[PDB]
């Protein structure tokens, strides 16, 4: 809960600027992540996590269509059932099931 200045490094994570963008590396654990100036996230996993990961970024295997695996372990055809299945509440807030926005295109 404490604000900390960049660059930073603790517990084997390194948090720094790279190419003008905010970077958060943990290749001891086997990942690295970044936020660009537009606010786009990205995450990279080492092959250590192939077919051994889950969440909104999918399950990391040769198939693309066996993603959307829920925490209940089912597939779903609905991205919002998948993503809400991976929602994590906390003492800071307990969170509602999100739904698609309205459209008129």
């Amino acid at each position: 809960d404490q604000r900390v200045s960049m660059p930073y490094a603790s517990k084997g994570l390194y948090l720094e600027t790279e190419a003008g963008y905010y970077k958060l590396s943990g290749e001891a654990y086997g990942f690295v992540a970044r936020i660009d100036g537009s606010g786009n996230f990205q995450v990279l996993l080492s092959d250590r996590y192939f077919n051994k990961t889950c969440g909104l970024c999918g399950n990391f295997n040769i198939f693309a269509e066996d993603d959307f695996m829920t925490q209940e372990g089912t597939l779903t055809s609905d991205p919002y059932d998948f993503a809400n299945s991976w929602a994590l509440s906390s003492g800071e807030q307990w969170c509602e099931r999100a739904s698609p926005p309205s459209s008129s295109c």
Binding site: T70, Q71, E72, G73, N84, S85, W86, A87
Partner: protein, 105 residues
């Protein structure tokens, strides 16, 4: 076999480890083999009929607790208290001491 109590367990969240009792079923061979189901939301059914509480039927009594929990009694020797949210308390008199089996030993 004067009584049997069965519980239905379900995964009560998207979390794998969040498993809880959804419903309870009680079989009473001495009461013409009545089958009593205590349901989610503190409802009750008997032989598949949705009964209205309070109920008295020979040795069997079923009543709403001030907690809105369903309380069931079968004589003075068996009592149960079902909250409708997966909490079940079962009380046996010492008449049953050493005589039980199931998950409660």
């Amino acid at each position: 076999h004067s009584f049997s109590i069965v519980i239905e367990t379900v995964q009560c969240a998207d979390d794998r480890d969040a498993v809880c009792t959804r419903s309870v079923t009680v079989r009473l061979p001495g009461l013409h083999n009545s089958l009593v189901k205590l349901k989610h939301g503190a409802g009750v059914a008997m032989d598949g009929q949705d009964v209205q509480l309070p109920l008295l039927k020979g040795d069997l009594r079923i009543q709403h607790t001030v907690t809105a929990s369903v309380r069931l009694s079968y004589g003075e020797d068996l009592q149960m208290d079902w909250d409708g949210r997966g909490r079940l308390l079962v009380k046996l008199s010492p008449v049953y001491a050493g005589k039980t089996c199931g998950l409660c030993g």
